[PDB]
């Protein structure tokens, strides 16, 4: 009845607000229905906005993601006579790099790794993906756990503009923002490791 597709890459998140969108082009383009499940092909995730883990539009939202949430989730995509079930491994880690090095990011998945081209005007991104109901407040950026304060760096909402990339620009970057969902405020901090090409 439904074609099983296995996602080869694991998605990692800190124990804080997290959202993953069921965007799998070309299958999710056009008139299709999307249903999120939590390690089941029969019982879906809750649709109650007040649930800690719930389906918000095409997204699975964790407010917040916490220890015990790691596992396999399923996005069932149904079109006009067509069914696909994506098995997605979402994994939570407990701590942030600037607080402690223990129990943090277990591996450098693609999302936590970015590159800056030496001598070029380049940019970094947050990897802060949330549905429209999660309004992101002012975004602050850090380099090696200290707020960025340099002529070549410019915060531009969810992007960090970097002028004339130098070799000293290698290091860990992070972006922090206040997330506002249903009148409640939560904090989100996302890190990245940047290497200079």
């Amino acid at each position: 009845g439904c074609k099983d597709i296995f996602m080869k890459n694991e998605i990692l998140s800190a124990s804080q607000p997290f959202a993953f969108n069921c965007t799998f082009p070309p299958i999710t383009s056009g008139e299709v229905s999307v249903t999120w499940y939590k390690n089941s092909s029969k019982i879906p995730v809750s649709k109650i906005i007040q649930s800690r883990i719930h389906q918000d539009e095409t997204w699975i939202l964790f407010l917040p993601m916490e220890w015990g949430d790691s596992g396999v989730y399923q996005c069932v995509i149904k079109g006009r006579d067509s069914c696909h079930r994506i098995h997605v491994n979402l994994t939570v880690f407990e701590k942030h790099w600037c607080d402690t090095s223990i129990g943090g990011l277990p591996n450098l998945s693609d999302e936590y790794k970015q590159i800056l081209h030496l001598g070029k005007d380049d940019s970094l991104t947050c990897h802060l993906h949330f549905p429209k109901s999660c309004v992101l407040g002012p975004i602050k950026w850090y380099k090696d756990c200290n707020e960025i304060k340099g002529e070549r760096f410019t915060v531009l909402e969810t992007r960090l503009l970097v002028s004339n990339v130098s070799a000293e620009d290698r290091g860990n970057y992070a972006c922090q923002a206040i997330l506002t969902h249903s009148g409640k405020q939560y904090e989100v901090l996302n890190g990245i490791t940047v290497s200079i090409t």
Partner: antibody
Amino acid sequence: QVQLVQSGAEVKKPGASVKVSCKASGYSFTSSWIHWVKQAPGQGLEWMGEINPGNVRTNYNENFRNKVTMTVDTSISTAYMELSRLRSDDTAVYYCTVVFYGEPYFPYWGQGTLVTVSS
Amino acid sequence: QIVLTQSPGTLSLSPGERATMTCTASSSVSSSYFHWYQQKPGQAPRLWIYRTSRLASGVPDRFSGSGSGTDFTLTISRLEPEDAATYYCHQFHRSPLTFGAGTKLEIKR
């Protein structure tokens, strides 16, 4: 290549303090946690704590709270471990090690520093 | 504190034999946070096996790591004289960081 160079061996009388150095190279010093590990003669390894040179934040093992104090001088890429109120139980080879983001293990270590506590 | 109970404490084997050492954690450790180190006298510990089963730089294929949750194992399939060392397991999951008491490997001849 990533390298950690520690200060030389020291003898201190009981009650004194000692400061051990760990000068790093081969990577951006401010981007990684420096950890300190104790090895008393003939014994195993005991984790003492960690310091982030970027924000100077420290986390000590509860067993070493107020015995160990960790510090950094980012201008010379050096991490410092200070031990106070020295006793023969503090006699050990102390190692510094470094952890990188997304790589939660100790791939590089210093040569060690023997601190002997004696009258 | 996650306690790591390493066994045996000492192991005496001839070259070519299989060396097996186990490490038991009091609480579950994720595969990415469990490691083994090799230490020779008068030298610092060397990363030997990282993330439960990956071999660190310069580590021969005769070494392998396995395990999950609370039970982990380090195996040397065909002992060489160079393997005489102390091996320590290690967890990077919860504070404070802990190590097993060690397994000293002696080589018979």
